[PDB]
Amino acid sequence: EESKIRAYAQWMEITIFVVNSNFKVEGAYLRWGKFHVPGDKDKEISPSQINGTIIKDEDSYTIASCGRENASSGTEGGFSLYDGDKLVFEYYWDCPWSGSNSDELTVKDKENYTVIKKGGGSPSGAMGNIFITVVKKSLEHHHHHH
């Protein structure tokens, strides 16, 4: 009952909201901690339950991970988002039990997508809530082919 309070003290929730296409989560993994149903750290889900998830246009989806009860140095992992067969971004976080939070968002097609993260990086204490927006550029607005 106090093993978990401790381990749960390092936690993140990442919400991906998308516009102008349907996108797919793939490549989710963890090296430390567990994934779980957002809002309920006692309900673990696997990478495989995340991978393949489609985020529909004008919807979001949240991934959540925290420390493992009586085990882990916090949470450390990542995932990738695709638009069909096109890799849009790779995300990675390392939020250790004892140490400084870090992350990294690698945008793979800046030309066709606007991808913006809020939260994340290197805050104190628990990693916390992180938000990524992804907008597939509309030619009539962005004129982004040339």
Side-chain angles (χ1 to χ4, degrees):
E1 192 191 317
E2 275 174 89
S3 279
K4 322 152 50 147
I5 308 321
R6 174 172 75 252
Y8 284 8
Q10 178 55 293
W11 64 275
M12 58 84 90
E13 289 198 4
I14 187 156
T15 295
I16 306 99
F17 184 87
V18 308
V19 181
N20 202 34
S21 204
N22 311 314
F23 294 77
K24 184 181 61 167
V25 183
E26 292 291 339
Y29 73 95
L30 292 163
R31 283 171 173 177
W32 295 96
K34 64 183 180 178
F35 284 125
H36 65 84
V37 171
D40 187 352
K41 298 182 195 174
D42 298 320
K43 280 172 145 61
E44 169 168 18
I45 67 182
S46 64
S48 70
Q49 295 179 274
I50 293 165
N51 285 343
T53 291
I54 298 296
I55 312 172
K56 290 170 87 197
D57 201 339
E58 305 172 0
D59 287 349
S60 64
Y61 172 72
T62 298
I63 290 163
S65 179
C66 61
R68 191 172 290 284
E69 52 287 355
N70 266 312
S72 88
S73 172
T75 174
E76 169 187 23
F79 63 93
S80 304
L81 189 71
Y82 295 78
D83 176 15
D85 288 309
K86 303 246 271 204
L87 179 60
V88 175
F89 72 76
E90 291 164 331
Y91 186 64
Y92 164 79
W93 66 89
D94 180 28
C95 310
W97 173 226
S98 319
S100 33
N101 295 309
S102 72
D103 75 4
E104 170 91 331
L105 169 75
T106 310
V107 177
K108 294 289 275 187
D109 185 355
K110 286 169 186 77
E111 282 210 8
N112 291 308
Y113 305 92
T114 307
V115 182
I116 306 285
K117 179 176 72 87
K118 304 272 164 206
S122 301
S124 289
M127 183 62 128
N129 298 287
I130 304 151
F131 181 42
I132 304 180
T133 56
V134 184
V135 178
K136 188 180 196 158
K137 288 178 181 177
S138 293
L139 179 71
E140 74 202 67
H141 183 267
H142 295 274
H143 306 301
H144 60 291
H145 292 344
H146 315 88

